[PDB]
Amino acid sequence: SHMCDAFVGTWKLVSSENFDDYMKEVGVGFATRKVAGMAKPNMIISVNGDVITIKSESTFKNTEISFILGQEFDEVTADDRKVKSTITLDGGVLVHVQKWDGKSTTIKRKREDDKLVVECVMKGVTSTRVYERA
Numbered sequence: 001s002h003m004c005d006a007f008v009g010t011w012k013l014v015s016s017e018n019f020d021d022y023m024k025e026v027g028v029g030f031a032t033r034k035v036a037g038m039a040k041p042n043m044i045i046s047v048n049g050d051v052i053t054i055k056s057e058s059t060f061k062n063t064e065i066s067f068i069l070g071q072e073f074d075e076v077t078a079d080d081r082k083v084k085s086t087i088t089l090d091g092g093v094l095v096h097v098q099k100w101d102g103k104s105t106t107i108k109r110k111r112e113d114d115k116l117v118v119e120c121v122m123k124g125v126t127s128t129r130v131y132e133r134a
């Protein structure tokens with residue numbers, strides 16, 4: 001109860017850094033990188049009991065995940081990877097690990113001032129995606 005309150009809401013992308021390089025490291029192909037890199041998603045986060053839902057809506061792709069913290073689930077990512085994901089809360093940060101084909105990437109979401117800051121890491125490459133309230 002009240003675990004993720006400060007995440008709940010409707011958020012819009014305001015800045016991005018190094019996302020194309022992150023996508024390259026993940027294995028995303030040229031055309032998907034270009035179209036996906038243009039997107040300005042909204043991220044809609046809600047909680048109902050133990051179930052957290054994160055929706056992403058953009059002109060590129062609309063996706064939605066629902067999950068319970070610590071409980072693995074199957075996810076098809078916007079770039080069409082079929083991954084096994086687990087999301088946990090670590091010191092106030094939502095930590096989302098995706099595993100596929102012997103690879104792994106981690107997406108961290110944290111509240112910083114009035115922003116929701118998303119850090120995506122694949123090996124040595126980090127992208128930072130900043131969202132603000134819609």
Ligand SMILES: Cn1c(O)c(Cc2cccc(Cl)c2)c(N2CCOCC2)nc1=O
Pocket residue numbers: 023026028032033036037039041056058060061077078079107118120129
């Ligand atoms: C944190 N984050 C994110 O995880 C994705 C999904 C994603 C991950 C890896 C490769 C790709 Cl192509 C897309 C994202 N996209 C949502 C769909 O429209 C394009 C932007 N924006 C983000 O801020």
